[PDB]
Nucleic acid binder design. Structure first.
Lengths: 122, 222, 147, 158, 57, 51, 184
RNA sequence: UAUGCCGCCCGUCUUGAAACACGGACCAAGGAGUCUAACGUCUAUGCGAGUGUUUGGGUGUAAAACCCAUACGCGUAAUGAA
RNA sequence: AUUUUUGGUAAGCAGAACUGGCGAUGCGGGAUGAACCGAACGUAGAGUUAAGGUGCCGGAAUACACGCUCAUCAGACACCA
RNA sequence: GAGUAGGCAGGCGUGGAGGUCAGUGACGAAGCCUAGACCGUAAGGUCGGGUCGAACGGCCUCUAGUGCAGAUCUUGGUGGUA
């Protein structure tokens, strides 16, 4: 059980002029200009990251499922979330071979741990 | 370890005798107010019949509410408003009328509205917006136990005992008034009337001494 | 540790903490003690009074080994005797078992008289002594043997 | 150039007074000054020795030193954002006693008399002072005082 | 070409962190007080010290 | 105290603080009359009022 | 919201030791507990003195301890030093005492044991005196460190100039004697 | 993507920049408070009337680690031109 | 920038005094504007107001009430044109 | 609970270093591409799909030639004018 999850600002904080120029990436960067409309916060410009947007501490790090994501490499690592099945969701690491994913998903369902990735790697 | 029909029942018996003291006190204050009105009203009628006018004793309580913003206030009024604890707009305090206070109101006139707070308006304010200073930490009263904890030293044991020591300027007025946190009022219900506030009330503005019309304003702002 | 330096915390901010008007230029006062009498007089006269001008007479080829004379107070005099044999002297030394403190081997020129020594004959051997040093050693009941 | 001399801007203040020129009256000298006594500073331009700076003219301090023809006064001198302890050396014609401190030092004895009296009697002393209280309820009587109905005036030249 | 002098913002600067009284100790500065009063006062206080050192029995 | 309720309504925190709230409501003290057969107009006040 | 004071100003006092010492944190843990529960003014003093830094816990000498027990009525109290207890070979007589320090020096440990006394910790102290019953809290002199004689140098303070060489030719000529210009 | 309303181009010097003030066509990569001798403050650590092994010797699984004598620097006394 | 004020015919000029502001400041209003008015700002909901307005653009009375004005160059909101 | 210049604190990311997870990996490391997904106020992190083919990572610490849009910056490449 959890309180109904709200996120005060869902959409990403794209860097100013990331749309305008290719040299500029959208990875958020504070506008430190002396005349910057984004820094000075004029009516109509983008919104900046402010701590006030911080997610509720009871809903923080929970997925839509309501499980804190835990990266898992092997069965040894999966076998730590045994008494923590209501709490976490095992997620197999990106670099794990198909045969090792066969073993983890077998063990995951055998213990009753929810997984977000495979899929079975067809 | 019983301590369910001994300790619980003991302090319940203590609570009941205390509420019985508070009952007869609130009955005494109701009697004190109703006869004190009747006396002043009869005195006015006695004088009219005699053929000789009756001057009502100069008001000894004023309720001050700051109607101005915080930007562009000069050092003199600014610090006077820091001493009356009106550090934001629609902040209310009480002040006992003396020479040392009437001259502060002359200084800060353009930043506040003040007047003579009725019994009713005082009662509504201390009920709905009763907050106390306890280890500063501004704590809502909600219980006459919290008053008689901090102000029981001075003899006030209730909400209606506190409202008494304000409405009738007591020997422990300073203590009761400084205990009360500066009232955080909202903007008035139907507005101010007054197209432009920051003229003096007499001109058709709002700021300064509105003798009895503060009561109306404050209830609207409550 | 480069990673704790505020240089790492400065990356992004235009002027690197040195301001937009000062600009951080090469030498906007000179190069070390420059203008001490001119535009750094206030800092020189304050904090460093006596910097400028000469005082006293010169000494050509001043060997610091002539002026050796390191000092030992009487509060520290008894600390020279080793703790193995110390207490046997400090409890009834008394004339003919009066201990011999050679202060030159200990590496002191003069003995000065700051401390109160215990009332014991404490035969002291020092190159130099104060008037109050030899007073207090004779008072305690010892002597100063010059060497 | 600009003038910042010792007795500069002091035409009218070290001026003597109208028909109070000439000699100092002898009570000035017969007056006794002791340490801890609060004294004013006001120069007598007729006397041009141990005279205070125009700053200290009007100030009030407390006597710290006493010598032949002169006292020593401590004054509070604000400079920038902080007061200093300014020690003057004033000849005795440039100072006087402060009735400020005289009216306090008699109120102390008036309080001492009130309390020492009312300790062994029926007590309602209230030793503290209170400001001008809002005036109490009085009846104003119109017996040979039937109010005069005033009206505002028409305008007229001269 | 420049300007010369203004006492603008100088009060604000002073009052921000400052205007402060010199704290007034008991037993004040007995320096620049009449030297012969001092010369005597020492011997008076030394006398009072001896008189209470005699009183201690 | 998770919530400041309000004495002036809810009726319960009004009966909690100020137990005299019962007696006031029961006796109808907010609607006290209670006179008169005086009755004392004036003599000169009325002439100085009208004029 | 005309703020009277600085908003979000820290108390300006240490609430923990910047020391990461395990055994000091175990000692702080004991005294944060006792400070909270006991309601004896002693335990608040010891908690703060444990937070204090090397410059503000200067070494209390045995000679200073011997002097503090020379006092009449306070001759059998336990000597609470929060910091080092150093040796002083200046004195010869030392009495039988119990002293609760953070650290002792090999010389200080020798002298206190030889007199016949008991070298205590703060937890060995706390187990016998939860309220600091019959204690004598001492502090070494703070304003004796060599850095403090340069604090607030100016004319005419009589404070130490920050220098590296101390003879003539080094900060005695102009502005330290009326002969060469002026004095201070 | 449409629609209502809002939104001048950033960086810079500047009392004041959307400026008819300067740099910038575009992109990738490289690209600017470093190290050192000597020091002030504050803090941590050791030992504490002392302290500092490492210039050097002994030793070694070999530029490491481990051990160590005599000095020496600073401190333990200041003030004087002397 | 209001107020006191010097030089100057004067200035969006030069120089002072006290205070408040911009600089370093977004937001509601004066159409637009660094400085004027109102209010100073974490992220949202609800309620109420400030200055300013409520024919239409444009959220809001083509509201009520007593008068004045007819201009072949009407007049229309302080700083401010 | 505003904020330039500025200070301080808490973290995000990079090349290496010591230790550890008997970590991942030719049944596919790293790299790159992705109007797919999830976490984080953010710096960023994680996952799915593709291409690819030989290495790489989490955490506790050490260290620095450690983070780019501007410098008529450097080198290389590319344009609109056409």
């Amino acid at each position: 059980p959890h309180p109904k999850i709200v996120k005060k600002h869902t959409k990403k904080f794209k860097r100013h002029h990331s749309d305008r120029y290719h040299r500029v990436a959208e990875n958020w960067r504070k506008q430190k200009g002396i005349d910057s409309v984004v820094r000075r916060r004029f009516r109509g410009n983008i919104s900046q990251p402010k701590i006030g947007y911080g997610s509720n501490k009871k809903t923080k790090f929970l997925s839509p499922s309501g499980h804190k994501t835990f990266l898992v490499a092997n069965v040894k690592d999966l076998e730590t979330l045994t008494m923590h099945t209501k709490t976490y969701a095992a997620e197999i690491a990106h670099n794990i071979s198909a045969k090792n994913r066969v073993v983890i998903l077998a063990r995951a369902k055998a213990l009753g741990i929810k997984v977000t990735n495979p899929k079975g790697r067809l | 370890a019983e301590q369910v029909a001994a300790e619980r029942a003991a302090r319940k018996a203590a609570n009941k005798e205390k509420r019985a003291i508070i009952l007869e006190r609130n009955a005494a204050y109701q009697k004190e107010y109703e006869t004190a009105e009747r006396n002043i009203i009869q005195a006015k009628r006695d004088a009219k019949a005699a053929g000789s006018y009756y001057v009502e004793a100069q008001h000894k309580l004023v309720f001050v509410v700051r109607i101005k913003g915080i930007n562009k206030i000069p050092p003199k009024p600014r610090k006077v408003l820091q001493l009356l604890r009106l550090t934001r707009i629609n902040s209310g305090t009480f002040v006992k009328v003396t020479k040392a206070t009437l001259e502060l109101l002359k200084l800060i006139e353009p930043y506040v509205a003040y007047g003579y707070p009725s019994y009713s308006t005082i009662r509504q304010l201390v009920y709905k917006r009763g907050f106390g200073k306890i280890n500063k930490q501004r704590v809502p009263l909600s219980d006459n136990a919290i008053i008689e904890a901090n102000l029981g030293k001075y003899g006030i044991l209730s909400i209606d005992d506190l409202i008494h020591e304000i409405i009738t300027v007591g020997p422990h007025f300073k203590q009761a008034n400084n205990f009360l946190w500066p009232f955080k009022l909202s903007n008035p219900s139907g507005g101010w009337g007054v197209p432009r506030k920051f003229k003096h009330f007499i001109q058709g503005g709002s700021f300064g001494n509105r003798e009895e019309f503060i009561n109306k304003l404050v209830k609207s702002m409550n | 540790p480069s990673r704790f330096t505020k240089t790492r915390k400065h990356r992004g901010h235009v002027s690197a903490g040195k301001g937009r008007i000062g600009k951080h230029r090469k030498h906007p006062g000179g190069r070390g003690m420059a203008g001490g009498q001119h535009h750094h007089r206030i800092n020189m006269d304050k904090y460093h009074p006596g910097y400028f001008g000469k005082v006293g007479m010169r000494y050509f080829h001043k060997q610091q080994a002539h002026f050796w004379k390191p000092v030992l107070n009487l509060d520290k005099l008894w600390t020279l005797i080793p703790e193995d044999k110390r207490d046997q002297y400090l409890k009834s030394a008394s004339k003919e078992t009066a201990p011999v403190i050679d202060t030159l081997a200990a590496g002191y020129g003069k003995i000065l008289g700051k401390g109160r020594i215990p009332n014991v004959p404490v035969i002291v051997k020092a190159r130099f002594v104060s008037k109050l040093a030899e007073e207090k050693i004779r008072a305690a009941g010892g002597v100063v043997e010059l060497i | 150039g600009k003038s910042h001399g010792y007795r500069s801007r002091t035409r009218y203040m070290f001026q003597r007074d109208f028909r109070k020129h000439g000699a100092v009256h002898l009570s000035t000298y017969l007056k006794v000054y002791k340490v801890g006594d609060i004294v004013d500073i006001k120069a007598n331009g007729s006397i041009q020795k141990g005279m205070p700076h125009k700053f200290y003219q009007g100030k009030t301090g407390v006597v710290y030193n006493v010598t032949k023809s002169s006292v020593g006064v401590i004054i509070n001198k604000m400079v920038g954002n902080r007061y200093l302890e300014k020690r003057l050396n004033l000849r005795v014609e440039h100072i006087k006693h402060s009735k400020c401190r005289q009216e306090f030092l008699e109120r102390v004895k008036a309080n001492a008399a009130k309390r020492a009296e009312a300790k062994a009697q029926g007590v309602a002393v209230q030793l503290k002072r209170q400001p001008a209280q809002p005036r109490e309820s009085r009846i104003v009587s119109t017996e040979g005082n039937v109010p005069q109905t005033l009206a505002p005036v028409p305008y007229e030249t001269f | 070409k420049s300007k010369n002098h203004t006492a603008h913002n100088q009060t604000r600067k002073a009052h921000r962190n400052g205007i402060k009284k010199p704290k007034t100790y008991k037993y004040p500065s007995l320096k620049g007080v009449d030297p012969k009063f001092r010369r005597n006062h020492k011997h008076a206080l030394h006398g009072t010290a001896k008189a209470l050192a005699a009183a201690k029995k | 105290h998770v919530l400041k309720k309000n004495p002036l309504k809810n009726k319960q925190v009004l009966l909690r603080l100020n137990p005299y709230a019962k007696v006031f409501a029961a006796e109808k003290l907010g609607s006290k009359k209670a006179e008169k057969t005086g009755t004392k107009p004036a003599a000169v006040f009325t002439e100085t009022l009208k004029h | 919201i005309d703020h009277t004071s600085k908003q979000h100003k820290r108390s300006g006092h240490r609430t923990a030791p910047k020391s990461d010492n395990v055994y000091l944190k175990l000692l702080v843990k004991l005294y944060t507990f006792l400070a909270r529960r006991t309601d004896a003014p002693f335990n608040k003093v010891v908690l703060k003195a444990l937070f204090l830094s090397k410059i503000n816990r200067p070494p209390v000498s045995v000679s200073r301890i011997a002097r503090a027990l020379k006092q009449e009525g306070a001759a059998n109290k336990t000597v609470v030093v929060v910091g080092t207890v150093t040796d002083d070979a200046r004195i010869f007589e030392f009495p039988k005492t119990t002293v609760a320090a953070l650290r002792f020096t090999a010389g200080a440990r020798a002298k206190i044991v030889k007199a016949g006394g008991e070298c205590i910790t703060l937890d060995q102290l706390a187990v016998r005196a939860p309220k600091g019953q019959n204690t004598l809290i001492l502090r070494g002199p703070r304003n004796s460190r060599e850095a403090v004689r340069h604090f607030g140098m100016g004319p005419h303070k009589g404070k130490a100039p920050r220098i590296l060489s101390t003879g003539r030719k080094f900060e005695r000529a102009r502005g330290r004697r009326r002969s060469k210009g002026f004095k201070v």
